[PDB]
């Protein structure tokens, strides 16, 4: 078959375009290499190690075409290779292999990697390939395929190689960026507050492997030689890189630090985070790719990783229960915010029960009643979550993940600390499954928030049994919908592929199908490859006429 | 009927840390719930603090407890069933439930209490991998027994059990069988070895090889008969399984992970008491799973260990993070679970403090398809790798060379 | 005003300002002709199609219409002199680099754009799209949304769930 499957794990220390291949799998998969002067020595050597040692070989095929099995042959240790013979040898460091994860829905999901043979029994990926594969190391498995000819090797390494997939045509932007730990660490490393001592600097310098041995002069010479987080990260950025970004209220003096300015691959200001180093826009990875080429770019991923990870190892980072607690103050305010919405909902009930509520046009009373109640409840939840997020302080670990952009969101923090909020099946509040009540603990005809599944408590405080059940109800609805695509979508994608599968760009720039029928007179109506296309501003178009003339 | 949730709702300040309740009351109650925690089935009765978890994560746990290893029964040694997994050293969980009493969990537990640190530490525990202590593994952590048993009969004219000797056999040696055709307890097997030696009448070979990817020692061999006739045979094979890169492990909150790498104690980070994690999970696996219960279990279990008490993790009680935090503080630890830690490599403090405590972890089953179908074909087309496509999808069917007319 | 286009003129320019250590406090040695003629000539060179007839020549003019808008707006004389402050040397390098990046951006005959397209739409649809609608219903109430909607589309369903006219 020439292929292998196993569990995958992340490796801070592989290059972006590498795959750790367990030695034991590497012995099982061969490549037929024809014997030449350029390799006779190597092959001879390999044949001598045989099937059981790596780098070995499993067979030697002579001219006549006969395959000598090195597992059993009398002459396993007494073979003298001729030119023209083939040696089925083990895969080795730097062989291009094709690596893929299922289901593979788009093409950055089979990419060619360079092998790195390693101990233990899992495949190992650089952290930044995780996203294009939609992989994680919680039991996921992957397939490795070994090309079997000189032409197919070339094909893989010149067309599928990981670095050639960095900028993707899917959305005309990077499909890989700095993630997880490295994103968390990279923000922290680059705050104005981060300073490094000489001793630590020398290590970090030494860790970026394409380093020229020249110690950047410290941002602070006296009272003590001290180096910026920015200064050292900068070593990982290659010369001739320029980048310029302006977030909200960024000035040429960015009070908040905030924004991003890179000149000649030296960070002038701005905290490096997801909009600078994620798969952004953008975006240092976009920029380096385009200015410096895929190889140099692909190496950046590992330089930054090596440097940041090391800094992170010695700084440390954690999260705990205390990061979900709000000082309340905030609590009092959140409790009061909700007590407020229970009052607007009560006042609308009294109203609508007097028969004073007016319907709108083309909505029932009951419909337009529900609408009001759901908006009060939603904006209460909303502003209770906001109250919690402002109280989180800079040292707050969750808030730090968030700022760095590494997981998760407002909603996450809000359910945990403020208020889970309204459960819902089929887009309405919890239905009267019992006769006129949602549970037998209520009286009949009770449309209060409690009754219809507003969860008032956060996960921190824990749910009451009623809120527990209603939250399960909402729970299940999401599970069922996940189970309906898997596979309702693996089926759409198969249909989409079939309709388009034969469209190709021809040497006259037209796109045509297999009968040769014209589909677009020029591809994309502009003849361009989506992977070389990026958001740019058409100035000519905005502003007053006075502005344009000037 | 009208049902009261708590019996307290049948009677006639507010502690900020409690969850908010809404009564009315009521005066018209006909019944009252025995205990609300009773709406849960058997699986979910095992999750500590499910009322602080995200709804679907409870569901994931419910399927996962079913893949944990424990001690399925106490007579395990005398049953010869298809597969079995037993922990060497099951521990009762520091955070239990009232419902666990009736579920026999404390008695037949399915995990151990790891000292778990929540830390970014070297980066080998990202996207849900875990860093495990090689030294705790050395000392027994998560080590488990594994038994597989193979079966075979004779006949249905005749077949017989015997060591055969080439008069079409299988590759792996028949060396280990006695002459009755069976290996015997104590013999160490591996690879493809003939476990059961069977012949069909000179002689066509029908013996049972050992599962290719395995090994161990033979445990019991049983010879017997079915209600009529058949002499049949069952061979149980023992293996020990040491925690290892790529093995799966889960807390009781529906997030699994595998071991990314293992460090020895020296290389680990450490508290000032010289305490060291058995296990390091990533912070990033936390915010978004909405997995608060896991943090509370950890807070709760640390107090338990310190004080020698079972930590009550039952749903719908009055137990609170503040409660637990105040208990922990009394033990002289930082109220909120954090501890100052030092970097193993270096001994230097970490600039961050680490959430650090015990938590109950389950070892899950499985170590011990490959395909190029439609969708891989499409990726390679998308790359326009046509040579590879030709080579992968073809055959040794080799070029037959034919001649064709140019007109017809 | 922001639309995906090839060749990032802004960056080519910040490169030029860096490579040539552009002294912002001096006159440029660019003439008016250098710029106006320079830029006109560069458009003649942004090739997507090459056939020498009236039809392909028009198709070519159409193909680079939007890009040339961008180009003329970035390389307006005043903008070059007052904002960018390019020198004759820097400017000449901006032009030829735009040309090189441009030709480098053309799609390559042999691209399987079809599978490309399908995979580009399919992968997000199953990435997902999670839900389904939300749903809705009753209140506010409804409008179907992908995937059920994506399916209605691809099916060309005559019996669509929530048809709606928008009337201005």
């Amino acid at each position: 078959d020439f292929s292998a499957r196993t569990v995958i794990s992340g490796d801070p220390n592989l290059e972006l375009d590498q795959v750790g291949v367990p030695k034991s799998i590497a012995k099982t998969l061969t490549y037929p290499e024809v014997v030449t002067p350029y390799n006779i020595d190597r092959l001879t050597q390999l044949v001598r190690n045989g099937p059981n040692e790596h780098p070995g070989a499993k067979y030697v095929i002579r001219d006549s075409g006969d395959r000598i099995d090195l597992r059993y042959s009398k002459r396993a240790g007494d073979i003298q290779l001729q030119y023209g013979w083939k040696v089925e040898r083990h895969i080795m460091d730097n062989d291009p292999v094709l690596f893929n994860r299922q289901p593979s829905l788009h093409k950055m999901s089979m990419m060619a990697h360079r092998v790195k043979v390693i101990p233990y029994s899992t495949f190992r990926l650089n952290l930044s390939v995780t996203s294009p594969y939609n992989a994680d190391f919680d039991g996921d498995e992957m397939n490795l395929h070994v090309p079997q000819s000189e032409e197919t090797r070339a094909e893989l390494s010149q067309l599928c190689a990981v670095p050639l997939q960095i900028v993707s045509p899917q959305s005309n932007k990077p499909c890989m960026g700095i993630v997880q730990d490295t994103l968390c660490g990279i923000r922290k490393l680059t705050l104005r507050d981060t300073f490094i001592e000489l001793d630590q600097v020398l290590n970090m310098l030494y860790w970026v492997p394409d380093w020229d041995g020249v110690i950047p002069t410290p941002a602070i010479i006296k009272p003590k030689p001290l180096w910026s987080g920015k200064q050292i990260l900068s070593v990982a950025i290659p010369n001739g890189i320029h980048l310029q970004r302006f977030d909200e209220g960024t000035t040429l003096l960015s009070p908040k630090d905030n924004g991003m300015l890179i000149i000649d691959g030296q960070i002038i200001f701005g905290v490096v985070e997801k909009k600078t180093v994620g798969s952004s826009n953008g975006g240092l990875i976009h920029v380096v790719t385009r200015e410096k080429g895929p190889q140099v770019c692909a190496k950046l991923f590992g330089n930054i990783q090596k440097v940041v990870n090391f800094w992170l190892l010695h700084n440390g980072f954690s999260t705990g229960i205390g990061d979900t607690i709000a000082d309340g103050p905030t609590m009092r305010e959140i409790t009061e915010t909700i007590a407020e919405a229970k009052k607007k909902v009560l006042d609308v009930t009294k109203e609508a029960q007097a028969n004073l509520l007016t319907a709108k046009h083309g909505m029932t009373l009951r419909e337009s009643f529900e609408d009001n109640v759901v908006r009060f409840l939603n904006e209460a939840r909303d502003k209770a979550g906001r109250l919690a997020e402002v109280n989180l302080k800079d040292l707050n670990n969750v808030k730090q993940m968030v700022m760095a952009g590494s997981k998760g969101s407002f909603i996450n923090i809000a359910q945990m600390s403020a208020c889970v909020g309204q459960q819902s099946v089929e887009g309405k509040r919890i239905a009267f499954g019992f006769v006129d009540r949602t549970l037998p603990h209520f009286s009949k005809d009770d449309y209060s928030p409690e009754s219809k599944g507003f969860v008032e408590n956060s996960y921190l405080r824990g749910l009451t049994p009623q809120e527990f059940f209603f939250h399960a109800m909402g729970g299940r609805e999401g599970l069922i919908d996940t189970a309906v695509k898997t596979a309702e979508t693996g089926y759409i994608q198969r249909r989409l592929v079939k309709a388009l599968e034969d469209i190709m760009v021809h040497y006259d720039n037209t796109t045509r199908n297999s009968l040769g029928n014209v589909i677009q007179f020029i591809y994309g109506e502009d003849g361009m490859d989506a992977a070389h296309i990026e958001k740019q501003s058409l100035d000519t178009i905005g502003g007053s006429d006075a502005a344009f003339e000037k | 009927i009208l049902i009261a949730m708590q019996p307290e709702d049948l009677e006639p300040d507010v502690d900020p840390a409690k969850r908010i309740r809404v009564s009315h009351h009521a005066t018209t109650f006909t019944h009252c719930e025995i205990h609300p925690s009773m709406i849960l089935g058997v699986a979910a009765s095992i999750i500590p603090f499910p009322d602080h978890n995200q709804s679907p994560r409870n569901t994931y746990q419910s399927a996962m407890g079913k893949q944990a290893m424990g001690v399925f029964l106490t007579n395990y040694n005398v049953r010869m069933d298809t597969m079995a997994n037993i922990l060497y050293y099951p521990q009762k969980p520091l955070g239990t439930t009232r419902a666990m009493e009736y579920l026999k969990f404390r008695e037949l537990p399915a995990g151990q209490n790891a000292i778990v640190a929540i830390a970014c530490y070297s980066g080998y525990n990202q996207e849900d991998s875990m860093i495990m202590n090689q030294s705790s593994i050395d000392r027994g952590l998560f080590r488990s027994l594994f038994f597989r048993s193979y079966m075979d009969q004779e006949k249905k004219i005749t077949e017989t059990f015997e060591k055969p000797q080439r008069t079409r056999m299988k590759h792996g040696t028949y060396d280990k069988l006695d002459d009755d055709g069976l290996i015997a307890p104590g013999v160490r097997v591996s690879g493809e070895d003939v476990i059961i030696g069977k012949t069909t009448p000179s002689k066509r070979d029908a013996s049972t090889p050992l599962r290719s990817t395995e090994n161990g020692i033979v445990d019991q061999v049983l010879v017997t008969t079915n209600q009529d006739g058949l002499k049949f045979v069952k061979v149980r094979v023992r293996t020990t399984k040491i925690p290892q890169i790529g093995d799966k492990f889960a807390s009781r909150h529906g997030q699994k992970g595998t071991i990314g790498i293992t460090y020895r104690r020296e290389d680990m980070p450490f508290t000032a008491e010289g305490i060291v994690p058995d296990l390091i999970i990533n912070p990033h696996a936390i915010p978004s799973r909405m997995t608060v219960a896991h943090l509370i279990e950890c807070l709760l279990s640390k107090v338990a260990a310190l004080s020698g008490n079972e930590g009550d993790a039952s749903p719908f009680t009055d137990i609170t993070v503040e409660g637990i935090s105040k208990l922990l503080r009394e033990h002289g630890y930082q109220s909120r679970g954090f501890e100052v830690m030092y970097n193993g490599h270096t001994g230097k403090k970490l600039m961050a403090q680490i959430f650090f405590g015990p938590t109950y972890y389950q070892r899950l089953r499985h170590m011990v398809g490959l395909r190029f179908g439609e969708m891989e074909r499409d990726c390679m087309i998308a790359h326009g790798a046509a040579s590879f496509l030709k080579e992968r999808l073809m055959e040794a069917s080799d070029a037959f060379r034919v001649h064709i007319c140019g007109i017809c | 005003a922001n639309w995906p286009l090839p060749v990032n003129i802004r960056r080519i320019i910040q490169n030029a300002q860096q490579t040539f250590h552009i002294d912002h406090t001096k006159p440029s040695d660019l003439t008016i002709k250098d710029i106006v003629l320079g830029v006109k000539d560069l458009q003649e060179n942004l090739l997507v199609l090459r056939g020498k007839n009236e039809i392909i020549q028009n198709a070519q003019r159409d193909a680079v219409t939007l890009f040339c808008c961008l180009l003329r707006s970035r390389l307006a004389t005043r903008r070059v002199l007052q904002e960018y402050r390019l020198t004759k040397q820097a400017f000449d390098w901006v032009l030829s680099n735009i040309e090189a990046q441009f030709l480098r951006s053309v799609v390559h005959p042999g691209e399987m754009v079809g599978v490309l397209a399908a995979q580009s739409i399919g992968e997000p649809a199953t990435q997902m799209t999670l839900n389904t609608f939300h749903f809705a219903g009753v209140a506010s109430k409804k409008v179907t949304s992908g995937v059920p909607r994506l399916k209605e589309i691809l099916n060309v369903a005559k019996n669509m769930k929530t048809p709606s006219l928008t009337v201005y």
Binding site: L377, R381, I411, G421, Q422, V425, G474, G475, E477 | - | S140
Partner: peptide, 8 residues
């Protein structure tokens, strides 16, 4: 599980 026109 969040609110109407968000999550169940």
């Amino acid at each position: 599980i969040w609110g109407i026109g968000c999550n169940p």
